[PDB]
Design brief:
homodimer, 127 residues, alpha+beta, Beta-Lactamase, five-stranded antiparallel sheet, Multidomain regulatory protein MT1410 (chains A, B), signaling protein
Chain lengths: 127, 127
C-alpha cells in the first residue's frame, strides 16, 4: 500500500484527525503511551500535555476504575473491547467507546486506539 | 500550539487515523477533494483510489442523492450537519454521519471532515 495515495499525506491526515468530530486517541506499547490525540479528546480531558507519556503516568487516579485492565487485555490478546456508559470523575460522566489493537506488517501488536463518545445526557436522563 | 507535542507526530497520527475503528474521511476545497481516508472508509467504499480527487469525480453516480448539497452547505456556511439513516446503493444501506467544517488560523474554511456509522442493521430490522 502506498500510504500517501491510499490514506493521505501524513501532515494532511493529522490535520483531519485533529478536527474529526469525535474523541480519538492512539496509544503505543505495553505502557499505553499517547501517540495521537485530537481536539475533541483534549477538550474531554483538558488536564494535559500527554503525547509521549504512559496513560498511567498522566492519569494516576484512574487505577481503580480499571480502564487500564481493559487496555492491557486489548494489547495482550488482540481482542477488541466495546463499553457502554463507563462512568468517570469531574474536576459524573458516562462514555461509550470502542478500543481495537493496531498490528504491524508482521502481525504483532504495537498498540491500541479508541473512539470515545460522551453519552452522559442519555444516562443523566434517569430523571 | 506545538502540533507534535499536543496532537502527535504527523506519521504517528496518520497510522492511528488509518486504524481508528470508525469510517473517517477528510475533504479539502470547494470541490471536496479527498485528503484523508482510513481503512474503515476504504472498506465501506472499496471502489477507489481516491486521495487527491474531487468527490464528484470519483463518485459520479451520487449527484441525485445530494450528499454533495450537504457538503457544500457545510463548506460554504460553516454550519455542521448530522444525518441519520441516509440510504445508499449496493454493488440498500443506511448511514449516520456528522460533518464539520475545518477552519484555518485566519478563520476561513479550508474543508470538511466526517465520521460515518453504518446503521443498516437498525433499519433492516424493520421486519
Amino acid at each position: 500500500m502506498d500510504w500517501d495515495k491510499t490514506v493521505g499525506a501524513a501532515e494532511d491526515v493529522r490535520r483531519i484527525f485533529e478536527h474529526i468530530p469525535a474523541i480519538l486517541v492512539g496509544l503505543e506499547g505495553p505502557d499505553h503511551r499517547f501517540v495521537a490525540v485530537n481536539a475533541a479528546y483534549r477538550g474531554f480531558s483538558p488536564l494535559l500535555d500527554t503525547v509521549g507519556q504512559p496513560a498511567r503516568e498522566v492519569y494516576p487516579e484512574l487505577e481503580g476504575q480499571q480502564i487500564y485492565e481493559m487496555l492491557d487485555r486489548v494489547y495482550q490478546t488482540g481482542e477488541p473491547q466495546s463499553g457502554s456508559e463507563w462512568r468517570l470523575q469531574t474536576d459524573e460522566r458516562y462514555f461509550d467507546f470502542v478500543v481495537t489493537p493496531r498490528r504491524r506488517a508482521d502481525g504483532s501488536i504495537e498498540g491500541v486506539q479508541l473512539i470515545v463518545d460522551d453519552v452522559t445526557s442519555r444516562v443523566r436522563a434517569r430523571q
